Amino acid sequence: IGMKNSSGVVVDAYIPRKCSATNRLIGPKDHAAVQLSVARVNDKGKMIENNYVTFAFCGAIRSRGGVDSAFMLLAQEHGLME
Amino acid sequence: PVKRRNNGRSKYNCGHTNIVRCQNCHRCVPKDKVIKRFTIRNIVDNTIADDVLNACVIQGFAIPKLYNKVQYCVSCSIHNHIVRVRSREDRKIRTPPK
Amino acid sequence: MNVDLLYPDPVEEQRKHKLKRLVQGPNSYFLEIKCAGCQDIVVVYSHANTPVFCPGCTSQISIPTGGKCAFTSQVERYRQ
């Protein structure tokens, strides 16, 4: 990722996360944006497995209210929780 | 500024409405903008209703009601307190209050 | 639900207008129907507005309507 310089080393600086659902860069002042994590579980003795898939949703997505449907959809297509 | 979306009138899909006159002022007012409060009252006041009801020699006749649609011009309505000047916030309310 | 486009729901497509659809298609069909006098089946449009006469009883079997043609005599159902 990053804006590479002619020498082949990224110059840029901080790299913003992109919202999982709509791929709009989460901006520095996107205070509304949140990045919750869903816990994978074992077959039986369901327990936190020490690794959480990480999912980001920007505030514009949040305002639409689409995050809840997109979040459910995101797990089912990606498997993971659903 | 435009005070009301309605424009003070209920004209929708029309260019002209039938004129009516203020009952008090006699100003010609398009039917859409008239205040139009219908009233169903009693032929005599309640204070006289008891005495008239006792007076009648007929077996079961109630004081017969009077039905009139009062239509008022805007000025006649605000002066006679039929309608009140409200705040920009409450101006939107449409339900008959009180 | 992951329901998407290019492969859409048939029931959902029917409710949508014939031309506002991925493929604009007829909303009308042909009807196999059987008259009281004659047991042979006459194929008729579902929305015939034309006066249509039975091949048997002289009177027309088609009553024209705003949508689907109503019938006056005996009725069969579902053309095959």
């Binding site: - | - | 207008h17 014939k18 031309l19 493929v23 604009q24 298609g25 007829p26 909303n27 042909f30 196999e32 194929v43 008729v44 449009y45 015939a48 507005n49 034309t50 249509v52 006469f53 088609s62 053309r79 095959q80």
Partner: protein
């Protein structure tokens, strides 16, 4: 949008994807072409010839069953309308409003509809004259329209 009105409506006809003849239908191209020819003997207009084939016979689409449209069948037999039906139907309407106007001189609304209908007859005639489906000599006037119908 309607040419002469501020009205928007869509009530079209949706031809099927299949351009091939239906299985239940038992009419050969000659069988329906014969019906088209006898319907021309009755004088029925091609819009009605197409409707009659659709409902009394089961040929909902003529071009699917045959290889050509009703007027192509007629033109091959040289039995097509001399004045294309669309113009002719407008001309009937223009004379019908004009007849009513002769009795009533105060129907300004009726007069207005005449200007719109007449304007279509002129517009369709210029296209028909350019295509040569109409003789170039043809002119729709108005007073002489009664004879033209």
């Amino acid at each position: 949008g309607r040419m002469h009105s501020k009205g928007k409506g869509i009530s079209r006809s949706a031809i099927p994807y299949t351009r091939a003849p239906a299985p239940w239908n038992k009419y050969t191209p000659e069988d329906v072409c014969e019906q088209i020819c006898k319907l021309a003997k009755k004088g029925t207009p091609p819009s009605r010839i197409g409707l009659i084939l659709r409902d009394q016979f089961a040929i909902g689409q003529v071009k699917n069953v045959t290889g050509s449209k009703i007027v192509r069948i007629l033109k091959a037999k040289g039995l097509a309308p001399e004045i294309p039906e669309d113009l002719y139907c407008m001309i009937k309407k223009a004379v019908a409003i004009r007849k009513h106007l002769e009795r009533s001189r105060r129907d300004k609304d009726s007069k207005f509809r005449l200007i719109l209908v007449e304007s279509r007859i002129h517009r369709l005639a210029r296209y028909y004259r350019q295509a040569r489906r109409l003789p170039p000599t043809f002119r729709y006037k108005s007073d002489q329209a009664a004879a033209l119908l």
